[PDB]
Every structure is written in C-alpha cells, then in structure tokens.
C-alpha cells in the first residue's frame, strides 16, 4: 500500500473502513437522558458525528 | 567564432585567420633541430649543476690547471 500500489481511500488502507471512526455497527447511545427543554447556560455535550 | 564579449559583438571585432599556415614543414624542422641542440646542452648543464664542483680533479685529471692573466689581475686587485 505504499509505492507500487496507490491506495486512494481509507477503505483501501484498512478493509471495511469508510470514515474517520472505526466501522462498528453499534450506535453508542447517551448514558444519560438530555433535557427536552434547555435552560440558559446549558452547554449541551458535543457530538463527534 | 562565436564571440562572447559585449564589446566584440558591439564593435564587430574579428579574429582574421590566414589562408595558409605561416611556417612550412622545413622551417618547423629547422626550429626543432635548434631546439634539440638546446635540449642536449640543457641536459648536460643539468648534470653539471647536479654534480657540482669536483675538487678531487687535481689528483687525476690531465694538465696542471690554469688561471687567466686577467683573473690573476682581478685576484691581485681584490674585491
């Protein structure tokens, strides 16, 4: 995958990969529920997305 | 010629070349004969310089040595 072979994509480099995150079929749910209605000074947790 | 000089290109200076060589084979041969004489004499001179003076000559060499009268007069006059 370096000189004789030109690997264009992350999937080419590592089989089964299609993005920055590993190809795990598990959607990691939030460990704790979030407030449906927010409040001033909340700073909701960021999403790796 | 392919001149490379600014002044040469500007003023059109030229290197004229004759139609015939200046000297002939016989002339070059004569000059080489003179040069060969020079070379033989120079080899002899180099040998003489290498070996320097030989003060032993008075022991075996023919003759009894000689000083020119002018050389004697110079010696008498001194330095």
């Amino acid at each position: 995958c370096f000189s004789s072979q030109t690997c264009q994509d992350i999937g080419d480099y590592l089989p089964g990969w299609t993005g920055p995150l590993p190809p795990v079929a598990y959607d990691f749910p939030p460990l704790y529920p979030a407030p449906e209605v927010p409040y001033t000074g909340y700073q909701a947790p960021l999403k790796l997305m | 010629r392919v001149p490379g000089g600014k002044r040469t290109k500007e003023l059109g200076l030229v290197v004229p070349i004759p139609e015939e060589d200046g000297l002939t084979d016989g002339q070059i041969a004569a000059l080489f004969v003179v040069a060969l004489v020079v070379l033989i004499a120079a080899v002899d001179l180099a040998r003489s310089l290498y070996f320097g003076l030989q003060p032993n000559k008075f022991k075996t060499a023919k003759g009894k040595g000689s000083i020119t009268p002018f050389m004697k007069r110079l010696i008498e006059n001194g330095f």
């Binding site: - | 010629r1 392919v2 003023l11 059109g12 070349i17």
Partner: protein
Amino acid sequence: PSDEEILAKGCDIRVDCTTKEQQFAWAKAYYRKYNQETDGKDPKYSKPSTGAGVFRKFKIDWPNPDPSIPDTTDGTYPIRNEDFLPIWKQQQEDLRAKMKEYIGREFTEIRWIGDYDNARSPYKPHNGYY
C-alpha cells in the same frame, strides 16, 4: 557596397584603408561572414524536466510511477480534488446560514481593539455582548 566585394578588396591601413569607418565596415563584413550568434546547441537541453508538467516524457520513474504526477505531457497541471471545491463552498454556505438562523441577527465584524461584555455577565451591558 556588399560584403562580397568588401572582403574581395580587403583592408590595409598601411596603403588605402586609412579611414576608420572603412576599417570597421570591413570588420563588420568579416564578422557577418565568419561569426555565428550561437554555437547551435540542441534546444532540448534547455527545456525543463521537473516541475514543467512534462516529467513523463523522460521516463525517469517508469517502474511504479508516482500517481500524483500528471500523466499528460502537455505541460499543464490539473487542480487536485477539483470536485470538492463546489462541495466545500456549499458546506461553508450552509454552515453560515445555520449560524445566522441560530443567532437571529446579522453577523457583526469583530473589533480587534474592542471590548465586549460576556453574554452571561450579571451586570447591565456596557458594550453589546455581540
């Protein structure tokens, strides 16, 4: 007159060509006849090989060639990842619109030397927090 007759007559300061103008005219005729502007070296040695977009002509790296180097020998370089530029513009415009809607007012240029109150400060605003 002409170079042919000028050189046929020739130049001699000692006898007839006592005129510096005639002397240099003959010199110019001889120059034009017997001198060349350039040695005539092959133009190929002057053309670039690397960075001119004509690298593939020389076949320097034929075994396992580098893909990033364009294959075309015309001397032109394509822009890498052309397709993304419209996509990037669309993404940035979408983000601009999203943040505009989220704030609810037009974006205001920040002041390098300006001072802005914190949005959560407990005291009355002195300068708008935005």
